[PDB]
Each structure stands twice: as structure tokens, then as C-alpha cells.
Amino acid sequence: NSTLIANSMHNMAIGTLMQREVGREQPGVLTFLSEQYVGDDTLFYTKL
């Protein structure tokens, strides 16, 4: 009953750790302006 919602929230958790780790390892390189999760699909709008 809750397949899509759980999938998208797990994707959100993965993206959160992605942002945290890239901020830790390479500070000041990428800034994140937008994050979108619709299931297994992830989209980012960033400035390099």
C-alpha cells in the first residue's frame, strides 16, 4: 500500500547522506539549490 512513499523517503535519506558526504570531503565546491525524489529517481539543481 505504501510502496512509492517508502521508496521516495529512502531515496531522500540517500540524497541527504550524499549531500553531507560531498560537503565533508570537498567543502565549498558544490552548492545545492534543489532536491527532488519521486521513487528511485533523484534530481539535483546545483551550482559548480
Binding site: Q19, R20, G23, R24, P27
Partner: protein, 50 residues
């Protein structure tokens, strides 16, 4: 023998209410003058601002 300072983390994200409440809590939890202290001067400044 041990004094405290504030830690700054860009990855941390929190509600501002946490900082404003910690402003009240710090004045009741710590000693900052007279005969000894538990805090640095910068830490006391930040608590005063909070």
C-alpha cells in the same frame, strides 16, 4: 581545567528555537566568573547573543 566552546558544522541543520532555548539553558548551567569558569569568553558572548 576543562572549558567549553561552540562547534560549527555546515552539515548540521536545526530549528532556531533550539539555539534560542539553549541561550536560556546556558546561563543556568554554567559558571562564568568570580573564582573560576567553565566557558571561554567567545562561548559566553554567543550565549548572550542567543
Amino acid at each position: 581545567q576543562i572549558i567549553l566552546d561552540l562547534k560549527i558544522d555546515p552539515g548540521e541543520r536545526m530549528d532556531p528555537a533550539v539555539r534560542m532555548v539553549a541561550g536560556v539553558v546556558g546561563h543556568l548551567l554554567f559558571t562564568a566568573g568570580g573564582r573560576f569558569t567553565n566557558l571561554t569568553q567567545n562561548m559566553a558572548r554567543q550565549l548572550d547573543i542567543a
